[PDB]
């Protein structure tokens, strides 16, 4: 994508709620797909600093943080965002279960 | 937990839909959280393998696959059951997105 000047001066220019979230998240992403992880990460921490109920958002910076080998922080969020958004009734049964297991994943019992 | 004979002797024994899917749950969480990522990992595939409409079982067998260091299968795994069970409007408008990016984490535009 030739989109990073797009949604960058989009991004510089007055902008609200839906509007400029989806510019974060679309600079993000084009930034992760062109191989720029740590640009992708600064632009979709923002995004996510902004817009904390943007589940997409969430979703994207998890990518990122799998891509820069953050591994760990990626996976919590994902089940975070599982946790607190899914449908499924199963999911739902266990959510407190995927709540707390999403920080302590490397954590075992005696 | 004490808990891997209760849920062996459980699934030892007649068991169906709802029944049988959270004792193969509840066994493959019980290794995990045992630190027995290798037996954690047999049961969940064999759960999911049996019971595959099972979202919660998907999500477990991901915090397994992390464990185990295939982070790749975990995090495209935790892609797809947002993707495909989330009530938000935002991951709902980028769902095709999700599940395309989601086999594909380390590919890159040129």
Same mark, same amino acid.
């Given at each position: 994508?030739?989109?990073?000047?797009? *949604?960058? $001066? !989009?991004? =510089?220019?007055?902008?609200? @709620?839906?509007?400029?979230?989806?510019?974060?998240?679309? +600079?993000?992403?084009?930034?992760?797909?062109?191989?720029? *992880?740590? $640009? !992708?990460? =600064?632009?979709?921490?923002? @995004?996510?600093?902004?817009?904390?109920?943007?589940?997409? +958002?969430?979703?994207?910076?998890?990518?990122?943080?799998?891509?820069?080998?953050?591994?760990?922080?990626?996976?919590?969020?994902?089940?975070?965002?599982?946790?607190?958004?899914?449908?499924?009734?199963?999911?739902?049964?266990?959510?407190?279960?995927?709540?707390?297991?999403?920080?302590?994943?490397?954590?075992?019992?005696?």
């Amino acid at each position: 994508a030739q989109a990073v000047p797009y *949604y960058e $001066k !989009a991004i =510089a220019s007055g902008l609200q @709620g839906k509007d400029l979230a989806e510019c974060y998240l679309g +600079l993000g992403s084009t930034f992760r797909t062109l191989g720029e *992880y740590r $640009k !992708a990460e =600064a632009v979709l921490a923002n @995004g996510v600093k902004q817009f904390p109920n943007h589940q997409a +958002l969430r979703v994207f910076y998890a990518m990122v943080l799998y891509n820069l080998g953050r591994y760990e922080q990626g996976v919590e969020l994902l089940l975070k965002i599982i946790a607190e958004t899914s449908d499924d009734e199963t999911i739902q049964s266990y959510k407190q279960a995927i709540l707390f297991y999403a920080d302590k994943l490397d954590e075992t019992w005696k």
